[PDB]
Amino acid sequence: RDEAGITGTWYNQLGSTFIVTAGADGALTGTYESAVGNAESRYVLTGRYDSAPATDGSGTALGWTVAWKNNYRNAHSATTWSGQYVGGAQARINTQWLLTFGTTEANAWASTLVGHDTFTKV
Amino acid sequence: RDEAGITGTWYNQLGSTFIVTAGADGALTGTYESAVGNAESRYVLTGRYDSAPATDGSGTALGWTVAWKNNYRNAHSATTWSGQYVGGAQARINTQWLLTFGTTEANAWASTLVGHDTFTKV
Amino acid sequence: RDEAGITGTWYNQLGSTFIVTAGADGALTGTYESAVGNAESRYVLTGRYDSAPATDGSGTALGWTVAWKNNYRNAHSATTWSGQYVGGAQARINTQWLLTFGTTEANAWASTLVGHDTFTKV
Amino acid sequence: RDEAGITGTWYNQLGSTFIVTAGADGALTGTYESAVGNAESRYVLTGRYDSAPATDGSGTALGWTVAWKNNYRNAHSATTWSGQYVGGAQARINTQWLLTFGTTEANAWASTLVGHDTFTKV
């Protein structure tokens, strides 16, 4: 239902770029490029979305993951975003995210950052 | 590096079952079956992991997503887990998760649950 | 240091109102009135802030809690906000929050909502 | 209702110590000593709890904050815990927490850690 609405290039408030294709079957595949952190260039992402969302004005739930390893750098971390796609003139993906770093067991208390990203098509 | 350690069947403290294959390239693919919530049977999951983790005793960062739609039910929601794989006699995936429900804009404040799951091989 | 900057009336993006006094000693006391949810009128809040923050342009860490019981209603829940005060012409408190509901042990997986609020003086 | 159950000394899985008094009116006051992180000795805490919880076996919602400044150290951070008290032979406070560090605006994306603590009386 939102396959066409989701597919494409999105940008967040940090200036990061998310390029995604939504599959008819609920798949999300693409690339992510972060404007911040221990990252450079594009990184693979994968995820899932609700391909048959409610028809009552609700958003479409979705999520995706990036492991922060590519040919340039390995940040020994992974971020997951969970959120919803809200269609309309000013389409948005509103997300919250969890960034986990690989740690030793003694530091595991301090292993996960939490934040929020809002993506637009502009 | 942890491709063999991750691949297989894992169980969390709720009695949910995660069946995953880790790809050499950082992919995670599989199925999830929740012991709780608006769910039945298996659901597709996808995700990513750090395929070249630090060699200093750190865990391996990873994450994955499930959209809660399959042939039996559609919960109009998606969960992402972010965490790390810790190998050894008692291997564990320690995760935190974010479950987003599709909502209207007025209810979007209340759209995301947060929790934590710990997965073992037993 | 930010005692005067914090003290006063703040409003978030939902239209909620936070009225706080910051003590020289790091205390926060006041009242919260939510524009949404199972709430009416004002509720007690308490919290803490860093009364000697870094002088390098960093924000001032702070947090506070509301238990959602007052003389009108009891929502059997509590929210904590964690964030930072950023002073300047357009002062802001940027927060993330965790709302826990009282649950049975079987439902405890689904006991905590996560979100984010941004408070301004206007 | 749980004023007597909450009041006292609690310990988490890291070996941290939380000493709290619960007031009839919903207040929590006390001290926290962390076994980990940029902390030493005791730090003031304050918080709130549901003083009239549901009678159907549900837990009692509660939260509290610590700003990580005392006479020994100032970590320019604050943690909030949100959770519930579950009474009975093996009483527990099950919490999730948000730790915010003071940051510059450029680093604010990376300002908040998320975790979970479970407190017992032993």
From Swiss-Prot, chains A, B, C, D:
Main location: secreted
Record's keyword annotation contains Secreted: yes
GO cellular component, one term: extracellular region
Amino-acid positions noted as binding biotin in the UniProt annotation, renumbered to this chain: Y32, Y43, W81, W97, W109
Gene Ontology terms, MF aspect: biotin binding
Domain Avidin-like: 3-122
UniProt entry keywords in alphabetical sequence: Biotin, Secreted, Signal
Localization of this protein: Secreted
Sequence motif Cell attachment site, location on chain: 48-50
Subunit structure: Homotetramer.
Function, in words: The biological function of streptavidin is not known. Forms a strong non-covalent specific complex with biotin (one molecule of biotin per subunit of streptavidin).
Annotated family: Belongs to the avidin/streptavidin family.
Protein name: Streptavidin
UniProt source species: Streptomyces avidinii
